Ligand binder design. Sequence first.
Ligand SMILES: [Ca+2]
Ligand SMILES: [Ca+2]
Lengths: 51, 152, 218, 15
Amino acid sequence: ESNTAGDPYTDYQKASGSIDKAIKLEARDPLVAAYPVVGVGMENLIISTNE
Amino acid sequence: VQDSNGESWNTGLSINKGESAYINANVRYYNTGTAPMYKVTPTTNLVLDGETLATIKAQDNQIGNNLSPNETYPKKGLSPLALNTMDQFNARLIPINYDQLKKLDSGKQIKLETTQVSGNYGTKNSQGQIITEGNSWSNYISQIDSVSASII
Amino acid sequence: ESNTAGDPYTDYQKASGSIDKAIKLEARDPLVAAYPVVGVGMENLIISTNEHASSDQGKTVSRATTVQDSNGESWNTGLSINKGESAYINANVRYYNTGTAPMYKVTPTTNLVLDGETLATIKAQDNQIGNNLSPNETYPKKGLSPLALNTMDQFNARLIPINYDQLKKLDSGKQIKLETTQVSGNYGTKNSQGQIITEGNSWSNYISQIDSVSASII
Amino acid sequence: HASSDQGKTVSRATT
Ligand SMILES: [Ca+2]
Ligand SMILES: [Ca+2]
């Protein structure tokens, strides 16, 4: 398998670090996937009553 | 003969019962992974008392260019985004009808929930230039979630 | 045949497993087709009747000398309605997959049928597209609230209207049914460099070829 | 486009 973890980067690109430099150190192990988990959080909510 | 000197003053108020109010949510994005996301495009449901009022995809005003792991968009010391519109071109505001407005004027809250997020990854092309355009993260979400074990 | 089953993947690609890793196990047999079966299901339906209601008050004073005086009041209440766009419809849907392959960029088309007549055929635009639909799962996922099929426009700016007769009969036992007439979506293939690409890879180019050369087993 | 309306009125007149 060239991409062991299933992410866009191969085993060599991850081990050798020749990828994006914002990827966490953790994710340069071929077994740990480089993978973002993004979520949204609402702060407040405003109602424009259009009479 | 006769004379008359009258005065008058009137006050009126109208309302549309299909678009009785406009909704504006203030949001912030969060990354808790090991990779940064470029061109972050979330999709969110706005749920009020069982019913989903609107499913909104983040358009050009609400997209975040970079989102590194363990950080937010906007950054920590900024105010949250405004999720104003439902249109592809940021020209159409999010409406709610008369019953949803009447119950919103009570203890009822509107909850938000992220159904998915879009975004790109970066790769170095022929010359040493990082490209993050055709590099959708969605082509790998199923392939990663299927071959893996999840640890939080 | 290089593609015995009629799916986008050859015999060697399926047998050896060098394809998408979300493809179900059985679908890596050359005879079983890698093929998703996506359907839509409605959860509830909301009606925004768009009347226009008006209130008004008023005072008035008056004097009249040949002597006289007068102090009148008023308060009025009106209500108007359009009969071609008497209400707006909002359906809450959720997509399902019961196939052996994931669908990327799931774009369904649904009829909204009310007492014999189809009110609208809606194609899922940018707000209502699901990026991933892996087999035996839903969009949105199990623990989320359903989508809002809110608009009928290519740009998500035009709401779904119903006229006065459809609204009047909808204020009765009449229900609006939803039915999926088709679903479109992409599949993934590894390109020259090992990047998965799911853009020109439409699933509709193989639905007829698969449905013709196959036997169906539910 | 169908429209309805109601209305009341009170009045007093003193010579
Ligand atoms: Ca390897
Ligand atoms: Ca063959």
